Amino acid sequence: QFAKPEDAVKYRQSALTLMASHFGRMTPVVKGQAPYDAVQIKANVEVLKTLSALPWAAFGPGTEGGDARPEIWSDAASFKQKQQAFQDNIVKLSAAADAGDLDKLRAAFGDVGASCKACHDAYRKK
Amino acid sequence: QFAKPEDAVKYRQSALTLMASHFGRMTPVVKGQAPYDAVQIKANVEVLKTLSALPWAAFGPGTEGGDARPEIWSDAASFKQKQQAFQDNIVKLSAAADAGDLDKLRAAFGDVGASCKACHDAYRKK
Ligand code: HEC
Ligand code: HEC
């Protein structure tokens, strides 16, 4: 759906921004600094699940640009493992939210955050 | 979820970018320039439905900025009508896609596009 590489870059940066916000806005809830409303968190994690599927198709071949490292494209399988692993960490968060289980939510939130870094450390330029 | 107005602006611009892409990528399909695959379009319109709910909460009071016109906030009810009307135009598109009805899809796509403009004409700076 992208006329030029720049369009893919713009898309993925926007998708990732919207993930930062839907993930990060739960930090006060996980920390207990804001109340835990199970229904609200369930709905927010559903949004996050949808968003978290979106960036990867905007790293198609030849879409070098932005802050993406070239290693995304020199080993396709390894980048795919990282995004798939990340989306499965989101599945754990979804299951916790759907269960209304705050302990579960906290653990999964931590693991999701670690997975965001795991990717950044390999694939995002400074 | 926004520390500063600038964060709300960044969010809504990213959400609207992702809507432009999920809407606009169907133009070749509606025109018949690309094949119509009902299952694919159903799934894409589901993404668009999720995205199309997201910008409006990032126009909270005091979030002037970007290319938003101030009239968003001097008549809250009228801006709310426009976003709600738009989301109901998306409902028509969703119903068409879920039915697999290409004629329906074309008509709804046109009406959605008109609704994007209807808002821009009142509420988006040049
Ligand atoms: C690899 C499988 C990634 C995972 C998992 C996550 N992110 Fe990431 N992110 C990645 C890349 C390669 C890039 C650079 C994209 C580019 O072309 O510039 C990024 C970028 C971001 C950004 C900045 C977006 C922007 O406005 O330019 C943010 C805010 C960001 N990423 C956040 C983020 C979070 C919170 C994640 C887990 C919930 C996450 N990313 C996962 C690669 C990958
Ligand atoms: C009002 C109810 C709107 C509807 C419906 C749509 N858009 Fe719009 N859009 C609106 C505003 C007020 C703004 C400016 C936001 C700001 O603070 O700058 C916009 C902006 C856009 C953009 C640019 C985003 C960016 O990268 O800065 C795009 C690409 C865009 N809008 C697209 C778009 C489409 C395709 C719509 C219908 C499917 C649509 N918008 C509806 C207000 C409103």
PDB file of C-alpha atoms in Angstrom, chain A residues 1-2 10-15 17-18 21-22 25 46-47 50-51 54, chain B residues 1-2 10-15 17-18 21-22 25 46-47 50-51 54:
ATOM      1  CA  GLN A   1       0.000   0.000   0.000  1.00  0.00           C
ATOM      2  CA  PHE A   2       3.059   2.303  -0.112  1.00  0.00           C
ATOM      3  CA  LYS A  10       5.779   7.000   7.845  1.00  0.00           C
ATOM      4  CA  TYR A  11       3.251   4.226   8.358  1.00  0.00           C
ATOM      5  CA  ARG A  12       5.402   2.084  10.607  1.00  0.00           C
ATOM      6  CA  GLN A  13       6.524   5.066  12.705  1.00  0.00           C
ATOM      7  CA  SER A  14       2.865   6.063  13.187  1.00  0.00           C
ATOM      8  CA  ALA A  15       1.855   2.480  14.110  1.00  0.00           C
ATOM      9  CA  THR A  17       3.816   5.598  18.112  1.00  0.00           C
ATOM     10  CA  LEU A  18       0.249   4.437  18.654  1.00  0.00           C
ATOM     11  CA  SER A  21       0.788   5.112  23.738  1.00  0.00           C
ATOM     12  CA  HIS A  22      -1.594   2.162  24.216  1.00  0.00           C
ATOM     13  CA  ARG A  25      -0.708   4.466  29.236  1.00  0.00           C
ATOM     14  CA  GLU A  46      -7.741  -5.170  22.477  1.00  0.00           C
ATOM     15  CA  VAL A  47      -6.666  -1.917  20.774  1.00  0.00           C
ATOM     16  CA  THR A  50      -4.766  -4.726  16.790  1.00  0.00           C
ATOM     17  CA  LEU A  51      -2.003  -2.108  16.633  1.00  0.00           C
ATOM     18  CA  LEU A  54       0.447  -3.551  12.040  1.00  0.00           C
TER      19      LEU A  54
ATOM     20  CA  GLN B   1      -2.691   9.493  28.482  1.00  0.00           C
ATOM     21  CA  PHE B   2      -0.839  12.613  27.251  1.00  0.00           C
ATOM     22  CA  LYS B  10       1.437  13.431  17.928  1.00  0.00           C
ATOM     23  CA  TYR B  11      -1.032  10.688  18.781  1.00  0.00           C
ATOM     24  CA  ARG B  12      -3.905  12.032  16.730  1.00  0.00           C
ATOM     25  CA  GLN B  13      -1.679  12.747  13.716  1.00  0.00           C
ATOM     26  CA  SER B  14      -0.365   9.161  13.875  1.00  0.00           C
ATOM     27  CA  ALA B  15      -3.905   7.720  14.196  1.00  0.00           C
ATOM     28  CA  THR B  17      -2.109   8.750   9.167  1.00  0.00           C
ATOM     29  CA  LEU B  18      -2.899   5.101   9.817  1.00  0.00           C
ATOM     30  CA  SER B  21      -3.531   4.324   4.758  1.00  0.00           C
ATOM     31  CA  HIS B  22      -6.180   1.720   5.656  1.00  0.00           C
ATOM     32  CA  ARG B  25      -5.272   1.396   0.145  1.00  0.00           C
ATOM     33  CA  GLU B  46     -12.037  -4.201  10.677  1.00  0.00           C
ATOM     34  CA  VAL B  47      -8.636  -2.514  11.157  1.00  0.00           C
ATOM     35  CA  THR B  50     -10.633   0.187  15.167  1.00  0.00           C
ATOM     36  CA  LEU B  51      -8.430   3.054  13.966  1.00  0.00           C
ATOM     37  CA  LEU B  54      -9.038   6.531  18.056  1.00  0.00           C
TER      38      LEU B  54
END
